[PDB]
Amino acid sequence: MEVKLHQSGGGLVQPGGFLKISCVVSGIDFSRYWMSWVRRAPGKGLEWIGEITPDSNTINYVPSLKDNFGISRDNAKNTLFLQMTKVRSEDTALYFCASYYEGFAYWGQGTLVTVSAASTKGPSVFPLAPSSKSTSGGTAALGCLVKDYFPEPVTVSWNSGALTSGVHTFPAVLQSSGLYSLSSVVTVPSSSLGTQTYICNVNHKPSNTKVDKKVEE
C-alpha cells in the first residue's frame, strides 16, 4: 500500500496527430478525488491543462487548451485518460496525472510526449574550438556541438573514454526543426593543448552514425 499514479502511453506523434495517455490510480479512493492533467516543458513552467470532477459531470479547462485535450475517467478501473488531438509542436512536454482535493496531493511519474515531423536523421558534429575567448587563465574549454539528430538517444565520449574528469554533456533540446541539438564540453589545462589531442566520439544508434571529430584550435 502506497499511492501509485502509474502513467503510460506517451511517445512520438507527428504534428496534427492524436494520442491518449493513461494513468491508473491505486492506493487512494480514485472515486473521491478530482483528477487533473498538468504538463511541464523545459522553457515553460507548470501548465494546468484541466480537471474532471469525481462524478465526471463537469470538465474544466483552460480556455486555450479546451479544444485539443479531452479528459475522461473510469472509476470502475480507477484510471484517468487524456486525449490529445491535432497536436502542435509546442505541445512537447511531460504530462502529469495529478490528484486534487485539498490540493495537488498525489502525482504521476510523468509521460513524455514528443511532437515532431522528423524521421530518423544522424547528427552533425562541429568542433567547439578553444581560443582565448574560451580560455580563462590556466584552464581552457573546448567541446563538440552535436546538431540536428532524431530521435533522442545519443552518447558522447572523449578520446574514446580516456577523458572523463570535467566533461559536461548538456541535455538535448528540441529545436523548431523537430530535430535535437546538444553540446558536450570539457575543461583541460591550456598547457596540455599543445601536446594532447582531443576527440569527441558521438554515437547515434537509431541512425547508426558514429562520428569521431577532433577539436583543433
Binding site: 501548465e47 494546468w48 474544466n60 490540493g103 568542433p127 575567448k133 574549454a141 548538456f170
Partner: protein, 214 residues
Amino acid sequence: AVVTQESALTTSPGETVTLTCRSSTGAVITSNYANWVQEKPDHLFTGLIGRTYNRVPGVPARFSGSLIGDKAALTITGAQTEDEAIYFCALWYSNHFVFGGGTKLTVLKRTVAAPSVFIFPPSDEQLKSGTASVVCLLNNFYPREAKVQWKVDNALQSGNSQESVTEQDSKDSTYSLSSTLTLSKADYEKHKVYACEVTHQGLSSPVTKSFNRG
C-alpha cells in the same frame, strides 16, 4: 490573467523565507484558491498548500500558506537544504487554474560559486552548411539562477537562443549551463560582435565574453 512570482530567492538553513504570488487582476482573494506545488530534481512534484491556508495531508509543519497584502504567500519557517527546489503557485480564475512562472528557492548548501564563462564561435564546417551557432558556456556556478543575455552588436537578442543545464553535482553543488544562439549564415554575416553577458550572485559586475567575425 497573469500569475507572477519572484524568479528566484536565496536563503540559508534555519532562516525564515516567504514566497509571494501575484494576481494580474488585483488582490488575491480566497475565491482564487491559491495552491502551492514544489518541484524537485528529476521532475518530482509535491502539493504543499491548497485553498490558500490548508496544508495538504503529509506536508511538514514548516510550510505555511497565507494571504499577505495583495498576494498569496508560502512561508518556510526553518528552511532546510532539502527545501531547495522550484515552487509553483496556481490561482483559480473562476473555472481554471493558472500556475505562475515558478520561484527557484536556494537554501545555501555551500559558499556562493561564480561561473567561468567561455564563448565558442561557429565552426567553418557548420558555416558551409549555411547555419551559424554561437555557444556560451558557464561552468560550475552555485546558485543555479543566473542571467545569460545574448548581445549582437550591443543589441539584446530574444527568441533565437535555447538554454540547457546539467544536473546538480552531488559532490560540490555546482551547475553548468549551455547557451546556444543559432542564426542564418545570412543573418550571421550581417553583424559584427557576438557577446554573452552573464549576471550571477558570485559576480559583482556582469561578465561579458565577446568575439568579432571578420
